A paper describes a structure:
The binding of α-methyl mannose to CRD4 is revealed by four independent copies of this complex observed in three different crystal forms: two copies of the CRD in form αMeMan/1 and one copy of the CRD in αMeMan/2 and αMeMan/3. Each structure shows the same orientation of the bound sugar. Binding of mannose residues to CRD4 results primarily from interaction of the equatorial 3- and 4-OH groups with a conserved principal Ca2+ common to almost all sugar-binding C-type CRDs. As in other C-type CRDs, the main determinants of monosaccharide binding to CRD4 are a conserved principal Ca2+ and four of the five amino acid residues that surround it. In addition to the Ca2+ ligands, the side chain of Tyr729 makes van der Waals contacts with the bound sugar. The position of the aromatic ring of Tyr729 is established in part by interactions with the side chain of Gln730. In some of the crystal forms, the conformation of the side chain of Ile749 produces an additional contact with the bound sugar. For example, while there is a single conformation of the side chain of Ile749 in the αMeMan/3 crystals, there are multiple conformations in the αMeMan/1 crystals. In the αMeMan/1 crystals, the electron density map shows multiple conformations for Ser671 and Glu677. These side chains, as well as the Ca2+, have been modeled at 50% occupancy, with one of the partially occupied chain conformations binding to the Ca2+.
Author numbering: 640 to 761
Amino acid sequence: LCFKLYAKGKHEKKTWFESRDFCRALGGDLASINNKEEQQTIWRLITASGSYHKLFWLGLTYGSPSEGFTWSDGSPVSYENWAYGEPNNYQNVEYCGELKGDPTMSWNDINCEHLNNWICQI
Ligand SMILES: CO[C@H]1O[C@H](CO)[C@@H](O)[C@H](O)[C@@H]1O
Ligand SMILES: [Ca+2]
Ligand SMILES: [Ca+2]
């Protein structure tokens, strides 16, 4: 699949669910990062667009307590790149995953209603 960055001003930022719906309407989904190669592809896309250090929704959403975090596209959550100490469900309200678009490419769980950039796959 092809990844596409949506780096938006405040007017066009989206919640996790809004971002998921946008990517699905176009024929894809929010991006799943299933290995280091995908991660490095997205990092290069971030550098090519000058989007260094921006935050982006990924397809990470909590499933059942048993499943834990899942990918919206249904791929297995095998590879992980959570930031140290994450996911921490800070204040019990963090059920969606965002990418910190710096060289670490780390993930953090945050409130699903936060307005963010996002990355689609198509
Ligand atoms: C204070 O809350 C923020 O910082 C902590 C630690 O980084 C994260 O876990 C959390 O999701 C928020 O981004
Ligand atoms: Ca993937
Ligand atoms: Ca967190």
